[PDB]
Amino acid sequence: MKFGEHLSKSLIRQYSYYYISYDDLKTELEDNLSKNNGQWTQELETDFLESLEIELDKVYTFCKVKHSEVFRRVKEVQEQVQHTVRLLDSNNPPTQLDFEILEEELSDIIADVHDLAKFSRLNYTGFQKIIKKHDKKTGFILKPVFQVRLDSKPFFKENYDELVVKISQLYDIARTSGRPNFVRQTTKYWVHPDNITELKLIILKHLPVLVFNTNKEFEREDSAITSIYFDNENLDLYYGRLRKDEGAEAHRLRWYGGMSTDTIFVERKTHREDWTGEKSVKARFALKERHVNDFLKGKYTVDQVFAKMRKEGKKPMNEIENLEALASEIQYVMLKKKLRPVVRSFYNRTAFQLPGDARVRISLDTELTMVREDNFDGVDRTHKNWRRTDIGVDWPFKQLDDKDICRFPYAVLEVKLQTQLGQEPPEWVRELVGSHLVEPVPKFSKFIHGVATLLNDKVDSIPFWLPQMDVDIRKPPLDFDEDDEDDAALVAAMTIRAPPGKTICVPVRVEPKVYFATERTYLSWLSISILLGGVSTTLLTYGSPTAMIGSIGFFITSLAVLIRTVMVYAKRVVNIRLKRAVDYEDKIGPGMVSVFLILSILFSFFCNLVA
Amino acid sequence: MLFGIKLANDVYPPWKDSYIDYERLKKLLKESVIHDGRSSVDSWSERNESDFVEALDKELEKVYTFQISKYNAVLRKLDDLEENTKSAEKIQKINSEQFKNTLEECLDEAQRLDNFDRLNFTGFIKIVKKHDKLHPNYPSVKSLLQVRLKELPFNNSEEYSPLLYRISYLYEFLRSNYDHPNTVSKSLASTSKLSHFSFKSYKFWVHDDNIMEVKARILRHLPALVYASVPNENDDFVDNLESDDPTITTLYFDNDFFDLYNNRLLKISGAPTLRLRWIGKLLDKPDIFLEKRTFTENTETGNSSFEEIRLQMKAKFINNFIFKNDPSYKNYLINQLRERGTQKEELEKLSRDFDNIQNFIVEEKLQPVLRATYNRTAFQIPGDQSIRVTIDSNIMYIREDSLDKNRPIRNPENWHRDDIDSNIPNPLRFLRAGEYSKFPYSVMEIKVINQDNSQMPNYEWIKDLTNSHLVNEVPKFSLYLQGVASLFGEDDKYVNILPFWLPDLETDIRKNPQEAYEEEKKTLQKQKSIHDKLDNMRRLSKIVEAKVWLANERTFNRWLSVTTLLSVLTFSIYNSVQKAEFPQLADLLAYVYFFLTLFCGVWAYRTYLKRLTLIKGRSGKHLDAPVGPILVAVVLIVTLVVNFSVAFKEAARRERGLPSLPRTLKPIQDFIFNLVGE
Amino acid sequence: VEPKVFFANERTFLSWLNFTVMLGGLGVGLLNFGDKIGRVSAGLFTFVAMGTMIYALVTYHWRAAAIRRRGSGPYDDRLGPTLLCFFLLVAVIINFILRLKY
Amino acid sequence: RVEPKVFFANERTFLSWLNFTVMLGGLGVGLLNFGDKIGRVSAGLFTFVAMGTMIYALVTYHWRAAAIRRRGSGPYDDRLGPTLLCFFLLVAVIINFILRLK
Amino acid sequence: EPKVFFANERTFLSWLNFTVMLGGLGVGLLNFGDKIGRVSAGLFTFVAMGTMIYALVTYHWRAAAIRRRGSGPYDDRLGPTLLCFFLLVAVIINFILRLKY
């Protein structure tokens, strides 16, 4: 709660140790006042001013050094970009590495500028707070006197917005001429309505707000987002998205604002997966409202869609061809699979991000609602239209019967991080994600939840969060060796339900270092068989006729073990290939080998020591 | 009408002499010689300057001495009624009728004094600006007017006069406890809005050297709003990975008599303003909004309310909509929105708004007058309408009227100026002197909402920032009024009234911290005294992922171990064929096992190389190769079965027509020999 | 749900089974081929092989309690391997002494 | 700041390589003791391969121990050895098979 | 730490695997060999038994020196070298004695 406590985690550690010593000055003031029992002395004020002056000088010197460094870096990068542009028309201009490192340097400069601005503002606020507190507690007046000293060393009057604009212009130029590290993270959370204001206040201390209005005013319909999802009668896309199949696609029509908007975005989300993990893609193209219905029936051809873009010629022709191919694929899939609107999701979105900085992005979705728009029951809800027009952007939708509407009782938080390799995410983000205000729900989706909740009498598989919808989520305030890793896991390990007719469907992902595991186990079995097989052959052609029955026994044992191992390996490979869940504990192997070996050995002993 | 005619027709008959001599001063300025040109020979001499300064000095002396005398007379009468109040005793000796008549006389005198001050100030400002426009060599004469204005007992601003507040609360106490009946007077009730008992707006000017500090002070408490454009048709992409300030222009409307400006400057309740607003350039096809804004006051608390009617326009339909009274656009838009799927209530409201704005424009004969461009910065917590702060910068005014019937600045049949919105990269070079103006400061507005009857907001950091050396408070400032005063304020034909904040524009508005502290102390003391007096007389007197690399290496090692074992078995069987009981059979097992060891080595190497290729970079759906592990096992099964079958097929032929087997094991062989087929 | 624990369990079981497989192959080879010395030593080595096999199976099925009945600390079973570590030496010494007789 | 877990991994790798060379040397000695001159030549070639593998294993183990002694983190990469062993074994097997075939 | 104890157990299992294979081969050659073969097999089995005893002693020391958390014989530079020397000497003697007569 202390001001110094919030100052500590405001920025990274390299900016610490240079902040105003607010806590030290406050403690000194209180201690001196207590010792002298009031009655402030001129020498005490002199020492207070000396400490304030040395702190001010330190802050001013640090700010001056940082400003000089930032300006020098900007000038150097601008000259480098200009030289690269001059060399663009020359022979062999690299585009895959130089442009990327230039962009990385630009992003680093932007982050440094933002951090410096926040540092200056926080220090000014601390100075004002301590001066006000000293004036209030002590009978003497200091604010008019110290205002002159602050104005003599203006570390807070620097304008960093022009630098941001210039760096953004350079970034745009590089992106424009660059068309022939870092790690993403994305997490979702549920927030109780009682904690929305506190969460918003916490977020607002680090990022500004985005306003979709020319007057920069907060209007009711300026933040609404509406999506219509498409699916067939068998709900093929629902199951394809629930069980995360390769190439699973979601098709939606989206618009922003009220019912006066005449731009509808056709969007397709495609899920792809490798042994690295989660390489998903997203595509979209714009369309006019009056041509949407025709586009859903093929009457509106793809040629008429991109006529304006072809005529104006602003966009390169190859990108136009790519968009034409995407539109053709979407239309063909829509016609072939017999897709129709099935569900609508509505919510109000608030976005938090810094201009030109992609390190942290936050999104908050409130008033989440799902509305049924299908004709499977037997009632036509859209009347041949692509959306039902009896409701639009008016929450809550009270003119809808309770069987066609689902009202989500929580808000959805979305955190996107883009962290440079070698450094940790900001402390405030980590303290936010782990706290009593949010409940993490990985891989939450609005389309799946809407379909499961509304058409609950037509689906066999449901997500994991659906049965837990009645759980109260309020919480009170709070290289290595592979064999060695397996040994550590062994040491560590050694020392509710879906409604009837439905099963909780969860996809299973395996670490890539399982592909090499099973084969190794397989090999560790195969050699064993060979050894046993060896016995068989040395008792099939080198022994007396009275000892071949033990050869038969070893033959049977070797065949059994080998075919068992082949069966297990094939089962494991085919199950891992198609994303099923497997059992990794083989309970039959050791016992079968034990019994077969004992039987073979004893039988051979008896047959060679009989009569 | 002309300023001279208005001055002549508004003179109070008892006060003929006290008014300004506008015509005499204009003649003494020799404005006719400037007007006519032919005989410009008689220039401006020092004797003429001395005479003009002399006449202006005595005019100012007469006018302001009369004003001060009248103001001093009224306040004192009202001090009397104040005596019969303090004493909880002289209270019972009071009389209603004489006090009511005195209050009515005081109100009439205050209104007359306000009109007198407005007229005289307008005349003096016009004269001073006219003199300063001509004869640039000689020093300006605005110092005389500034000195005379500074001597006034009160502050020259658009705020209500202190006499109004005094009379208001005197009437409130007279009506409250002494005699509820026998009041009768209703004109005195109009001042009841000023009685101390919501939505309050404060306006300030900020110098360019103080913007960063006030921005830091605001950002301590409120966030910053960043403008983000809604996605449009040009933002369509093909395939990306997951998670892959504008200039505001407003054109204002008014008629040839400037009725809207006059009514707004006179604080007439319900005075509207009409404007067109957009951002960016007009050649990018942006959204154009037609707004009508009104402030109305219907309550005894004095709290005002603000109403706005907004319509969206198309660039083609504006000319017919605002000039020819064409109702085509209304029907076209209504049909378009009905086709889009808008409900009935929104359509009814849109039709009503269209009717209201079109009727307003037709009745009042409004037309575009001026254009203002600026940049806006806002601070507000989302979902919290309690407080808002906004700042406007880089304000610029441009004349966009058609008042000159011989060389119109804008065509009478076009809704906007043609030359400014051309394709030339820098159109503002075309502008001539006197057709544009630049406001030197930044304008900050603070809106505070206290819905409950909480006795004014009175919140902490707002009052801390207000009483500081960083801002200069200008009550009731407006961008439209300032633009009209700047562009058309020097012409007697159009503007006959001027705002009281004009003289403060020339002075340096920067303040030292010490003077600001002293003024803060004085203001706080005055407010505390007023509040204490009100409380005293109110109730007291009330009645690199190396792990995969290691795994690949270990898998290759295991494959090599299997190959070694197979080769060892192969050569052990092969190099001992001569001692085999069936040498014709041991020559095939060695061959097949040699083939198996070669295949194992080749497959191990090839799979290792392929998986190393996959590991380098990032590709491949899966890391597996099940073909070899299956083929090796299948071939081993086949070889073992064939060896067993051949051995036990030839074990019967050798014992036919040739002891060695135990008796107990005799039947068992007869089973296998039957299974093989002998 | 962690495969690596089960994988390590199987690795330990198969590493122990290698001993039994090798010893059983040796015993079968000695009994089927050779003079009385081999037939005498075959049972002696098969006893040790059977002991190792039984110990491996018991140890494996004892460690299969990673899903339930948790609480068993470190298996410092220094008496299992070492007691069986001397039987093979005894067999080797016996074979050396008895073979040298004839 | 050194832990036994890296020395244990080094020892396990060393004993794996010795497992390779013990299999190869056992084959070589078995072919040397019995068989004709062809078996003797095959045995000599096989024991040469086994000896080379054993010396390579010991050299790599000593280098790994020295690298662990001088702090750092080195014992994770070894690529030349597997390829060399694979090539040597393929050449040895094909040469012995061809020589016996004649 | 139990993890280090299990690592020591794994090392002992590897040692036992090597020693069992070597002793098995030695016994197999001994029971089917002549005087030269008998001497060679005795030498190989003696080398295997010595290495097995050394591994048992090292495993016993390590499995008890960790509870004390003292020095421990984690670093070894004599076992592998002595094993290499003994194997090389045994192979050389076997070859020279087989080719001598």
Ligand SMILES: CCCCCCCC/C=C\CCCCCCCC(=O)O[C@@H](COC(=O)CCCCCCCCCCCCCCC)COP(=O)([O-])OCC[N+](C)(C)C
């Ligand atoms: C550095 C390491 C050193 C190792 C040293 C110990 C080495 C152990 C050595 C030998 C093992 C015992 C073999 C005795 C065979 C007797 C029967 C027989 O058929 O013999 C015949 C041939 O025999 C051969 O040529 C067979 C070759 C055997 C290869 C090895 C198999 C052992 C296990 C491997 C499996 C993988 C291991 C996995 C674990 C098990 C006898 O032929 P002959 O011509 O009558 O005899 C010569 C007589 N004469 C000279 C008078 C003419």
Ligand SMILES: [Mn+2]
């Ligand atoms: Mn999302």
